[PDB]
Amino acid sequence: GHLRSGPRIFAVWKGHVGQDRVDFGQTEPHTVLFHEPGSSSVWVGGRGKVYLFDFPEGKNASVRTVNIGSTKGSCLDKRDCENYITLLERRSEGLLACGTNARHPSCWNLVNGTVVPLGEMRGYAPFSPDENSLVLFEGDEVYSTIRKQEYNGKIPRFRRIRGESELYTSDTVMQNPQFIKATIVHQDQAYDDKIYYFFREDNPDKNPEAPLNVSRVAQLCRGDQGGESSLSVSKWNTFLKAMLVCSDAATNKNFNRLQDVFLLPDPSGQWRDTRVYGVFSNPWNYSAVCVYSLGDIDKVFRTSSLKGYHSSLPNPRPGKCLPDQQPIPTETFQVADRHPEVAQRVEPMGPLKTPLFHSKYHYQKVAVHRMQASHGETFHVLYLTTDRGTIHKVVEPGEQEHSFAFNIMEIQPFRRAAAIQTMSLDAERRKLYVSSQWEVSQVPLDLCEVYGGGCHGCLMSRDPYCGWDQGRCISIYSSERSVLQSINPAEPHKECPNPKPDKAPLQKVSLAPNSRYYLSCPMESRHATYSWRHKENVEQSCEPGHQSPNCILFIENLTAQQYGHYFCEAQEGSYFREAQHWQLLPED
Amino acid sequence: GHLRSGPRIFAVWKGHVGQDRVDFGQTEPHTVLFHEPGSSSVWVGGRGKVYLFDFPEGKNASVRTVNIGSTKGSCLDKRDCENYITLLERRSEGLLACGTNARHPSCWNLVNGTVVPLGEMRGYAPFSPDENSLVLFEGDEVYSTIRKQEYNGKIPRFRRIRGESELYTSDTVMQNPQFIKATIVHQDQAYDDKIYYFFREDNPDKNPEAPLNVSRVAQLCRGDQGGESSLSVSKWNTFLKAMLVCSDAATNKNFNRLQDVFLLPDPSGQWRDTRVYGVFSNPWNYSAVCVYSLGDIDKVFRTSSLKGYHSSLPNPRPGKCLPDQQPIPTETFQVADRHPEVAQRVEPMGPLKTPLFHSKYHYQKVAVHRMQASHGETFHVLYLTTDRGTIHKVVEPGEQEHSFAFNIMEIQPFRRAAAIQTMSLDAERRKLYVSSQWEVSQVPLDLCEVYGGGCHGCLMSRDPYCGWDQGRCISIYSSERSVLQSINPAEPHKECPNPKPDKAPLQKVSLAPNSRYYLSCPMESRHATYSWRHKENVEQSCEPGHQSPNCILFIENLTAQQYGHYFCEAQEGSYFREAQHWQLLPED
Ligand SMILES: *[C@@H]1O[C@H](CO)[C@@H](O)[C@H](O)[C@H]1NC(C)=O
Ligand SMILES: *[C@@H]1O[C@H](CO)[C@@H](O)[C@H](O)[C@H]1NC(C)=O
Ligand SMILES: *[C@@H]1O[C@H](CO)[C@@H](O)[C@H](O)[C@H]1NC(C)=O
Ligand SMILES: *[C@@H]1O[C@H](CO)[C@@H](O)[C@H](O)[C@H]1NC(C)=O
Ligand SMILES: *[C@@H]1O[C@H](CO)[C@@H](O)[C@H](O)[C@H]1NC(C)=O
Ligand SMILES: *[C@@H]1O[C@H](CO)[C@@H](O)[C@H](O)[C@H]1NC(C)=O
Ligand SMILES: *[C@H]1O[C@H](CO)[C@@H](O)[C@H](O)[C@H]1NC(C)=O
């Protein structure tokens, strides 16, 4: 195909000082970020407090710290008795904030500039921040992955902590799981409502050539009553899990390590159309992004046979929810409990169950925005974080073989380059909130001052969020409900006033013979090939996989033959552009 | 660990004109190379002829062509009726040469400048040169993977073409096999002799996350009589196959695609100690080298259960050779014929079944030479061809965690850069024979004119084949029986006359202010970090992953401040070296 999976532009963000990003007073190793779409406030739980950020549109942003210290039993022999706020959820009672509280998990409520404690609440926050925690809210129910006690066993479980009855996953359903994400899926009838959650676990296949871990999606019935026996009453009786596969067909490249998940509801309102985007990596830290539909996952769960069970399944099929608050029959539960893994794998959406794309970058988080271009065309744009603390903006492919993912840009969003610890996409304000151990940054999705290059450079960027107008490249959500934006196919520059690009400004230099010199051409587009030409002969050529950001022609001891005009030309596809034009004139 | 898996030096071979390599008269796409260790002759089968190369030590080499034209029925409607020589084997009767002969497989005997035809001999040569062929000779028995007829099925087989009776492998033992290499293995008793062969085939595992092909080693009893029934008489009744695994422990990295195998008998003469070196790649064309022992492979074959078979095995065990020419019992053959894969995998030798090393290069062939250093120490040196037409010389690791494979050098052995078609190591003459589509080249295993960093460079090379003597870096097999060679541990330069390296020659240059300029430092050692220093500060730093071969410090418009000394210093581990020394003097 085409290696356009690399960022085309290494953006340089010239924002509006004091408006785009704010630092914490100190360094916060463990954090959590909360932000509701549309709001101008951003909450961050840190060490012994919760930062309140304000990002007023078009105006300077600021902080505000609300200390909620470990003041509930300070430790003698001070070591690490901080109160890391690891949770921030908004309830009708206000903003719930839970923290470790010197190994005494508790929660507080923030309503009106108030800090009302609710005391110890196990299962709402770990005993240590560096733990693989997870809690989900739905109505007056809460599900958690956090142990309720410290001397608890070494078996992580998914539990309903608040609700009709407390339920926990049994010892046979997972093997050293690492939870990623969890959601509620509302099916056709309310009693069929499922809870899905994604995680990684040990591979049941212990052969030496099998990868150590595998990726999964598990389902549970929201209205699971519990089992019939005294031992099965308090356990989930509707568990089932499936393997998630993200592999390229053309090549035999597999990405088994699921890193992050992002759900995107379809404009149709149909739950089956909800998209599950997953970022996967492999032993080399290369990644791929696969997309699954809730409909496919559910179909697998209700028709696939179970691994290791070779006989007709019980009437109430394992995993199937039951109508009128009926508990799962023992016979049905025992099959499920012994054979929790379905046999068929969950593969990506549509024909050719292949990834949207893959690359040699190490991606950790993903967020997606379905959006409309100036001309009404709909595009899905993915935002990925690398383990190098940067963000990639990729346009998802559409039609067929002619369409591929297009990595339009990479950006380093912080004042101080660092690892990205959290990321949240606000599709309402069209902003991307990212944070590190030092600051919090608000990155616009419609950032286009980055594409220079006149009108051609603007449309050649392929960024669906912008177009050319009033002599500049600006956001389509700007004001004037109309801008010159391009057409998908090759040569998207055709719609500019000048059918052909601007010539480079002529640069002159006078040099004596035998002198040592060099000509540098900074390569803006990383998809282009750059050539230095003299007397119609290419003297130097720099291809897209070029490490240095400049294509340099070295002139050793200048000879008479090497006097004159030197052009550095850029060629992407069938597009050509004069990037540099020098003239070496004799002067001794 | 350490990434010393990349070549430390890109050798530049200045040999002896007319002595090192000879071209064919024309271009040969399909070739075979024969060469008996110690000989000065190299035979190469090609299109309609066989080449006779002569590589007289210390003297110019030459060619000689012996046309064996398709003169045995020239085709009407000429297309591709050549007689590609695909086999060269010397027997007591003389040099056996077999070819395609216009889709009419035949052999010829070359005794004393004569070309005696033996006529059509199916199984000795394919019908087309691009076919996956394999023929093995042992005593008066010949084995082959080549079909005997052109209208034959789509099932490749391993057959005994010459011997007491013809035996062929059944339809059930392999699925689209691609043969790599075969060998006879003499065990304790003659009747236990085995034939082992390596190959790739389809993965029986059809799950979407499973890789498409897998690597195997198969075993057959040389003394196999056949079966007991009319249908099994002519079939091999002792076939068993096992998956060959080459995966890294630390990382989870798997290399499932076997590319080439090389056998190295132990000095002890113990078959069980024979080493099997396999080169493996993966979907990304990255590679690793794993080592196995005939002992470990045999233990797997006689002790492992069979995949898919869960009952006590038959008394005479599947794959076990029988004493007095007894045919394999039907009850034994049927278990084997239905379950030919043993369940346990063959893993690398020694504790921590891991590769000797892996790198991001795409290796295709391997040869190993056990050698002794000047001080009697023994090292195993690997010779690997990349798919870029180069050879890598790696030194196998020894002791423990402190020892790692060391890639000491890369070399382009041809006058014309091309893909390496064949490679054969002659431990007798200490040479490596490599061929392409245009030439054949003899490469010394003891090449050291390549290391030129004075005494220190020579020892810093870690190349066990050489040391410093008579004011130069030379081969330990040269003459004086005694040279100054280094010590395995860090800082192997210590044993040189001057305890510390030679300062770099001073270079002066006069320039006027505001003049543009640059300093280039060719980076010889690819394992060192190079730094340009001025006024005690580094202005430019180049780390090992540096693409270009030069560390360049750029000087825009020269200023008064930036006048003076400039040093380019290289530093591998705890070793320093002045690679360049410039002094910019003022002059207008
Ligand atoms: C925003 O912060 C900047 C600090 O760089 C400050 O100069 C400016 O006054 C603030 N914005 C305004 C105009 O209030
Ligand atoms: C916030 O304060 C207002 C007025 O003081 C009060 O009416 C309201 O109940 C408070 N919020 C909650 C839910 O405690
Ligand atoms: C699989 O990966 C997880 C998380 O990366 C790790 O905790 C676990 O130990 C790994 N499995 C094994 C046994 O190596
Ligand atoms: C990427 O993978 C490597 C192993 O190949 C690992 O050591 C490294 O930590 C990973 N990158 C990061 C920093 O997450
Ligand atoms: C060996 O070949 C080279 C180049 O073909 C030639 O210059 C040289 O004279 C030859 N050696 C002799 C002494 O014939
Ligand atoms: C070739 O040499 C062998 C052994 O020296 C001899 O038997 C044979 O006759 C020779 N070939 C011919 C036909 O001269
Ligand atoms: C497995 O891979 C090999 C080599 O890459 C290829 O020749 C073979 O056709 C593949 N197997 C199948 C049937 O796809």
Curated annotation (Swiss-Prot), chains A, B:
One protein family per Pfam: Ig_2
Domain of life, source organism: Eukaryota
Quaternary structure and partners: Interacts with ITGA1 and ITGB1. Interacts with PLXNC1.
Protein name: Semaphorin-7A
GO cellular component terms, semicolon-separated: external side of plasma membrane; GABA-ergic synapse; membrane; plasma membrane; presynapse
Presence of keyword Disulfide bond: yes
Disulfide bridges in this chain: 75-81, 98-107, 221-321, 246-290, 448-466, 455-496, 458-473, 521-568, 542-551
Source organism: Homo sapiens
Record annotation: effect of changing residue 162 to Q: Results in JMH-variant phenotype
Disease field: Cholestasis, progressive familial intrahepatic, 11: An autosomal recessive form of progressive cholestasis, a disorder characterized by early onset of cholestasis that progresses to hepatic fibrosis, cirrhosis, and end-stage liver disease.
